[PDB]
Amino acid sequence: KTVVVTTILESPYVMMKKNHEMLEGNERYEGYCVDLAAEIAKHCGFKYKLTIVGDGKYGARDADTKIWNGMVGELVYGKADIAIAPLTITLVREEVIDFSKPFMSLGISIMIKKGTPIESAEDLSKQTEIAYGTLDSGSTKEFFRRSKIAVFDKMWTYMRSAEPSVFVRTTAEGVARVRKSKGKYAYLLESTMNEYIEQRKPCDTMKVGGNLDSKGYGIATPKGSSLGNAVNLAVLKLNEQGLLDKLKNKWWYDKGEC
Amino acid sequence: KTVVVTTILESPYVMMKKNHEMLEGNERYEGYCVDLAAEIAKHCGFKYKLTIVGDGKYGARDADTKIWNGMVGELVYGKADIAIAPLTITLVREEVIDFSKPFMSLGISIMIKKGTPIESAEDLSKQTEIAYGTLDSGSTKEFFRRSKIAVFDKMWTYMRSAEPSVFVRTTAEGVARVRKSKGKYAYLLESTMNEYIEQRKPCDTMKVGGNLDSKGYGIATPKGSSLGNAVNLAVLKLNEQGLLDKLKNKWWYDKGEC
Ligand SMILES: NC(=O)CN1CCCC1=O
Numbered sequence: 001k002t003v004v005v006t007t008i009l010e011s012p013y014v015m016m017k018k019n020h021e022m023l024e025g026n027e028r029y030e031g032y033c034v035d036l037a038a039e040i041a042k043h044c045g046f047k048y049k050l051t052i053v054g055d056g057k058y059g060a061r062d063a064d065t066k067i068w069n070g071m072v073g074e075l076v077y078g079k080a081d082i083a084i085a086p087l088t089i090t091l092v093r094e095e096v097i098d099f100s101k102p103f104m105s106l107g108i109s110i111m112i113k114k115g116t117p118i119e120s121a122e123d124l125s126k127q128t129e130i131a132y133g134t135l136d137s138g139s140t141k142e143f144f145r146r147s148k149i150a151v152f153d154k155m156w157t158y159m160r161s162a163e164p165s166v167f168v169r170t171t172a173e174g175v176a177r178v179r180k181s182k183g184k185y186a187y188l189l190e191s192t193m194n195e196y197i198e199q200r201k202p203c204d205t206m207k208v209g210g211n212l213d214s215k216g217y218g219i220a221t222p223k224g225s226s227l228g229n230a231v232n233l234a235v236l237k238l239n240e241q242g243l244l245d246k247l248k249n250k251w252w253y254d255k256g257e258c
Numbered sequence: 259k260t261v262v263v264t265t266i267l268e269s270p271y272v273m274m275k276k277n278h279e280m281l282e283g284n285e286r287y288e289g290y291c292v293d294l295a296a297e298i299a300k301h302c303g304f305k306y307k308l309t310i311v312g313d314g315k316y317g318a319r320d321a322d323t324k325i326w327n328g329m330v331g332e333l334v335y336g337k338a339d340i341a342i343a344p345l346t347i348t349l350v351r352e353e354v355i356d357f358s359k360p361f362m363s364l365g366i367s368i369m370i371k372k373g374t375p376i377e378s379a380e381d382l383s384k385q386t387e388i389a390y391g392t393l394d395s396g397s398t399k400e401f402f403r404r405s406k407i408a409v410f411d412k413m414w415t416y417m418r419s420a421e422p423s424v425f426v427r428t429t430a431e432g433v434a435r436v437r438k439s440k441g442k443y444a445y446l447l448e449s450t451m452n453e454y455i456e457q458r459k460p461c462d463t464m465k466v467g468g469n470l471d472s473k474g475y476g477i478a479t480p481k482g483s484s485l486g487n488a489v490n491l492a493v494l495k496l497n498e499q500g501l502l503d504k505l506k507n508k509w510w511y512d513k514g515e516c
Pocket residue numbers: 107210211212213214502503504506507
């Protein structure tokens with residue numbers, strides 16, 4: 001039976017094709033996670049259907065209602081068989097869904113407009129002129145909200161109370177804010193998305209400093225789903241055959257313009 | 259019941275304390291994986307005993323006999339309940355044991371004596387003056403055995419037939435051979451161990467070029483044992499709390515001598 005795959009529109013993992021209107025089904029989409037879903041499906045031996053997640057979120061649990069939103073939600077509540085996306089493996093998510101071993105490494109990083117007087121996280125903590133935020137419902141926001149560590153715990157104190165809000169709805173919103181703010185706003189986001197943007201015109205942003213942490217993206221399935229086993233084996237095989245490295249180069253760098 | 263942990267002596271993961279002679283049991287050893295074992299046992303609430311793996315190897319399958327040796331063998335045949343060591347998550351191993359999510363990242367790298375006229379794998383591949391090899395019964399050697407990638411496959415074709423053998427029993431032996439070969443031997447080994455050695459006296463070796471792949475170390479349990487769930491969740495918590503980052507600086511860079 002056809003596997004229903006939940007994913008998210010995030011460049012350059014899944015993107016609308018130039019002529020998306022004149023194509024049907026899986027043919028409408030392109031990018032890193034679209035190529036990877038075909039590979040996974042082929043080595044696992046299953047047919048599938050790409051679906052963009054209705055609310056455009058990665059997944060968080062609403063503290064009052066306790067309902068999970070985003071892709072995690074689609075898995076938790078039985079709307080999807082699998083998620084193939086830049087979804088971060090975390091402890092609170094591993095408690096309700098299953099993840100395959102990481103297919104991509106990454107860490108929280110800092111994006112600035114070129115020329116901003118900022119070199120690190122500790123530089124961001126002890127200053128007020130330059131504002132900074134993160135994406136609204138993901139692992140990046142929760143890392144800061146959950147952190148005991150100094151610089152980060154103080155950064156959270158700041159962001160949660162900042163006005164107007166320093167959080168954004170989408171990555172594009174974060175980046176557009178960076179570009180328009182003449183260096184008066186820095187954006188905290190995963191190193192992978194920071195690196196992609198740095199290679200796109202107008203070439204006016206850049207990643208500074210080392211990463212604040214170190215984690216991975218995994219293919220997620222409903223807790224105890226049988227599919228888990230085959231897809232984990234598939235990711236390891238495809239890393240070992242060099243597939244994942246080829247794909248990153250194709251979509252990040254063989255694409256450069258800066 | 260007391261947990262039998264199988265491990266390997268490999269700096270700076272597990273090493274003998276200076277005054278080992280006068281100490282007993284777990285107190286004999288120190289290092290990154292020694293601290294990580296305390297931490298895992300603390301959070302999971304089990305008592306444990308560290309045991310250095312009998313044959314001194316990581317684990318590979320004899321193609322004639324089909325018997326697994328090393329730490330992998332200890333788990334496969336029931337000599338041990340858990341393996342806490344720099345054990346590489348691979349596809350043939352995940353078929354017979356379980357791995358936690360990665361506690362540390364790394365790739366195959368190149369170690370040269372300072373001054374050796376080599377920057378990359380492609381370099382090594384196109385010449386015979388400088389010999390090169392890897393550890394026995396580990397994941398690096400098997401990386402080169404199963405390479406379809408153009409450059410690596412040629413390197414293996416060279417290595418397997420090379421003579422006298424370019425392969426070594428242990429890391430120390432590999433590193434001693436670099437140091438004593440006046441630049442006529444390069445050693446292929448994980449970036450992690452490479453970066454450690456580069457920081458220690460006599461300070462005569464170095465990591466050149468970029469990593470040849472990208473993979474992870476995982477905590478290993480016999481297939482479908484109950485321990486695995488707890489330890490997986492523990493690794494993720496420990497990464498999320500920054501402890502894994504504390505440990506790596508403690509053992510790697512706080513230790514610098516060059
Ligand atoms: N101790 C560390 O290396 C800390 N950092 C470096 C990159 C990301 C990670 O958590």
